[PDB]
Amino acid sequence: IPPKPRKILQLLRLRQINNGVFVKVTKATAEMIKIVEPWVAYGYPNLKSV
Amino acid sequence: VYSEKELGIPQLNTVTPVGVTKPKGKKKGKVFVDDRESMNTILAMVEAEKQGQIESKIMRARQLEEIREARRIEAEKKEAERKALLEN
Amino acid sequence: GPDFTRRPVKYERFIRPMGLRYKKANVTHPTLNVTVQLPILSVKKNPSNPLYTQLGVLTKGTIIEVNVSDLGIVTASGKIAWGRYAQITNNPENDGCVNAVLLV
Amino acid sequence: RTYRVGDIVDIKVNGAVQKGMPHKFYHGKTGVVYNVTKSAVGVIVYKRVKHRYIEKRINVRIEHVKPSRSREDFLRRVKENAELKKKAKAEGVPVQLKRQPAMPREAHTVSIADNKPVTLAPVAYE
Amino acid sequence: ARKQRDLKKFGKAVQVQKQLERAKQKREALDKINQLKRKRAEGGALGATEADDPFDVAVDNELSRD
RNA sequence: ACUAACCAUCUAGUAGCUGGUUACCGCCGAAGUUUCCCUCAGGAUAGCAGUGUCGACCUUCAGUUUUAUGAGGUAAAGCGAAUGAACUUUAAAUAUGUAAGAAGCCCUUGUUACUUAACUGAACGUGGGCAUUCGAAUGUAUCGACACUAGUGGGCCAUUUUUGGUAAGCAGAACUGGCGAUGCGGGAUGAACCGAA
RNA sequence: CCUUUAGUCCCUCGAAAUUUGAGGCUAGAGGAGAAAAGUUACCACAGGGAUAACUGGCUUGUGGCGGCCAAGCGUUCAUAGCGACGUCGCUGAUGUCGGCUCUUCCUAUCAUACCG
Numbered sequence: 001i002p003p004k005p006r007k008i009l010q011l012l013r014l015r016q017i018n019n020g021v022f023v024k025v026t027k028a029t030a031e032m033i034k035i036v037e038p039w040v041a042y043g044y045p046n047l048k049s050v
Numbered sequence: 051v052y053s054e055k056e057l058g059i060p061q062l063n064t065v066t067p068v069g070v071t072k073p074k075g076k077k078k079g080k081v082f083v084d085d086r087e088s089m090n091t092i093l094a095m096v097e098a099e100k101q102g103q104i105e106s107k108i109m110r111a112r113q114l115e116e117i118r119e120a121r122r123i124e125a126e127k128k129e130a131e132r133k134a135l136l137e138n
Numbered sequence: 139g140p141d142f143t144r145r146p147v148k149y150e151r152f153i154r155p156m157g158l159r160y161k162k163a164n165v166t167h168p169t170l171n172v173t174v175q176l177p178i179l180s181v182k183k184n185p186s187n188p189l190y191t192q193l194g195v196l197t198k199g200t201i202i203e204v205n206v207s208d209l210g211i212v213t214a215s216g217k218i219a220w221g222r223y224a225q226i227t228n229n230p231e232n233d234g235c236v237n238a239v240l241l242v
Numbered sequence: 243r244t245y246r247v248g249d250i251v252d253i254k255v256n257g258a259v260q261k262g263m264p265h266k267f268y269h270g271k272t273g274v275v276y277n278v279t280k281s282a283v284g285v286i287v288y289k290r291v292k293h294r295y296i297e298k299r300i301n302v303r304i305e306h307v308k309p310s311r312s313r314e315d316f317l318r319r320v321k322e323n324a325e326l327k328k329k330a331k332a333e334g335v336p337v338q339l340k341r342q343p344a345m346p347r348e349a350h351t352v353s354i355a356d357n358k359p360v361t362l363a364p365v366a367y368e
Numbered sequence: 369a370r371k372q373r374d375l376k377k378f379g380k381a382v383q384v385q386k387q388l389e390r391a392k393q394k395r396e397a398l399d400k401i402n403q404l405k406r407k408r409a410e411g412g413a414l415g416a417t418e419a420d421d422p423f424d425v426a427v428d429n430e431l432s433r434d
Numbered sequence: 435a436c437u438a439a440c441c442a443u444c445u446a447g448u449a450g451c452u453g454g455u456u457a458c459c460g461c462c463g464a465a466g467u468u469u470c471c472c473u474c475a476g477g478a479u480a481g482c483a484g485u486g487u488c489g490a491c492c493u494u495c496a497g498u499u500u501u502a503u504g505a506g507g508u509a510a511a512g513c514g515a516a517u518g519a520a521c522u523u524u525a526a527a528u529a530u531g532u533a534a535g536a537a538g539c540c541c542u543u544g545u546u547a548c549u550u551a552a553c554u555g556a557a558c559g560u561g562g563g564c565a566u567u568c569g570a571a572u573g574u575a576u577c578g579a580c581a582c583u584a585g586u587g588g589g590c591c592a593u594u595u596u597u598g599g600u601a602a603g604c605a606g607a608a609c610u611g612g613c614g615a616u617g618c619g620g621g622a623u624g625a626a627c628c629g630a631a
Numbered sequence: 632c633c634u635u636u637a638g639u640c641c642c643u644c645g646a647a648a649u650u651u652g653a654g655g656c657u658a659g660a661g662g663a664g665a666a667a668a669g670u671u672a673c674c675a676c677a678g679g680g681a682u683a684a685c686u687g688g689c690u691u692g693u694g695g696c697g698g699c700c701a702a703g704c705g706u707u708c709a710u711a712g713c714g715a716c717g718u719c720g721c722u723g724a725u726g727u728c729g730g731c732u733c734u735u736c737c738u739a740u741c742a743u744a745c746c747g
Binding site: 146147148149150151152162163164165166167168171172173174175187188189190192226227228229230232233234235236237238239 | 671672673674675694695696697698699719720721722
């Protein structure tokens with residue numbers, strides 16, 4: 001993993017595999033998830049998933 | 051082992067005198083030895099140095115008297131040249 | 139060039155064997171569209187090694203001076219040209235000939 | 243141009259002058275001035291090695307340095323918040339004094355009248 | 369000792385940079401020949417034999433005849 | 435006139451060199467690097483690891499994003515905008531420097547041998563407040579200072595960017611990743627492959 | 632002090648059966664001073680640095696240069712240019728090297744077999 005995507009995974013609290021967090025969508029947080037796209041899967045959850 | 055000419059070593063006064071020392075990095079005025087008498091006295095020391103040790107005491111003396119007479123004749127010519135320069 | 143020379147001491151180790159020498163070159167004229175075998179007069183500029191110029195090494199891109207007396211080039215003022223620049227356009231190390239194009 | 247010891251400068255390295263030009267790593271840099279001379283300016287820059295930053299000192303001439311405005315946004319905010327806070331306390335309602343990141347767009351409707359959509363092929367043929 | 373220490377430390381960097389200089393002089397020499405080559409093709413104006421001056425003198429003289 | 439052998443002892447003579455150097459378990463755990471020194475078989479310093487003390491504390495820091503401003507205007511579109519990569523309203527991709535408040539302020543006034551024509555400016559402060567979002571986001575399993583102590587101070591391979599050359603090879607530079615101290619699944623097999631510690 | 636560069640065809644000496652050679656004007660370039668200095672892909676000696684032998688789907692039967700032709704491709708395409716097959720033009724060695732060596736394999740076959 002390159003050094004820049006490593007730091008974002010730490011800042012997003014994704015320290016382990018099959019680990020999930022809730023993120024508020026802004027312009028500052030969207031570009032964070034864009035860099036770690038080779039390592040994460042994300043999307044918009046519904047009421048059931050919450 | 052390195053040469054004394056390259057190192058900036060001052061000249062030291064010994065039984066052999068230092069004489070007047072010319073400054074470094076300036077004109078060391080050329081003196082010419084075109085005169086035959088001045089050519090003979092230099093030639094006497096070159097021939098004496100190459101010959102080396104002679105067993106005979108008389109021949110060893112004649113090797114030195116040739117250098118001495120060469121110095122005297124050259125000195126007489128230089129004094130006459132100095133007198134001619136003083137006249138001019 | 140000449141058959142027997144006494145080289146300077148600074149070049150006396152550099153032996154050029156007799157079986158590796160060339161006297162004539164295949165020289166093409168760009169405007170007349172002919173190729174003739176002309177004698178080599180001197181090696182003028184090797185653009186790789188300056189020592190190769192002094193030793194006379196023939197290399198691709200090396201300017202040599204060739205005798206153009208047979209070609210009958212009429213210069214200005216009506217004089218038949220006798221020595222012209224030619225650039226070696228082949229690698230004489232790999233093929234046993236020297237190929238050149240006149241700088242006319 | 244007059245420079246003082248301590249301000250923030252940007253190094254551009256113009257190609258007109260070959261004297262006093264720093265390395266290509268120091269081209270397009272930004273640092274703090276620690277020393278001012280007759281024709282050169284000493285600038286302290288930061289360089290990263292593995293994880294830390296080793297501060298390096300380079301002498302850059304006047305022809306390659308220029309002032310920056312990175313701080314100028316911070317001082318523009320410090321007065322704009324100050325006047326807004328005084329103006330808010332004057333009439334007595336709160337105001338969001340912070341800057342917030344751009345939010346996702348809200349819902350809206352787009353009419354089709356006068357703007358009937360044009361169909362496009364994957365490649366243009368005409 | 370200072371001189372031998374720097375030559376022990378620079379070393380290979382001088383060796384590589386010397387090769388780049390020698391690769392540059394080949395390019396400059398070959399390009400100077402091509403400027404001569406295009407000039408004679410465009411026109412010429414010479415003597416019966418080539419000039420007695422060496423290269424980078426006779427070529428520079430021809431490029432100063434423009 | 436000058437200037438071999440064996441035995442015991444001084445002698446356990448001189449090494450930076452060769453070989454070896456003795457139970458178990460737990461906890462913490464590296465570097466293979468910068469700078470300087472008559473420096474390269476060497477010392478000091480800084481870094482990584484640890485101990486002790488002091489000081490704090492969101493008043494913290496961060497190989498991250500955002501905002502603002504630079505160095506690449508690098509592609510693109512237009513020229514029914516002007517002008518003509520060197521054209522531009524706008525502006526990619528890709529990495530990159532700097533700043534983002536309590537240490538900033540703002541309001542009143544004390545010192546100075548600095549400064550100014552001058553109760554004018556520059557530095558340090560006293561008195562009030564912004565202490566509840568205090569002036570982007572996200573995280574934070576704490577961070578800073580001093581003193582002391584041990585091992586370290588070799589590189590190999592690959593991606594991308596870049597420089598030069600050859601018939602083809604190849605040689606150099608920067609970042610990053612893997613291996614060196616790493617077991618496991620897969621690629622029949624295995625220093626450099628994939629997955630995953 | 633002369634040389635070169637570009638201009639005026641503005642001026643002198645020498646030669647020559649009417650044509651030349653040698654200098655001038657304008658302003659760019661070349662050549663602290665007899666102590667020594669600058670410089671080189673050169674040589675000799677001494678030392679330092681880098682590399683610490685090389686090659687491994689290698690090799691074989693048909694040259695190179697230059698022109699013409701040339702299907703295509705290219706930054707849109709026969710022209711920015713790259714560009715094959717052809718055709719035209721140029722072209723006794725040797726000598727630390729040999730001899731001997733069972734068995735087995737390859738065919739790139741000298742012979743024996745069979746074909747065109």
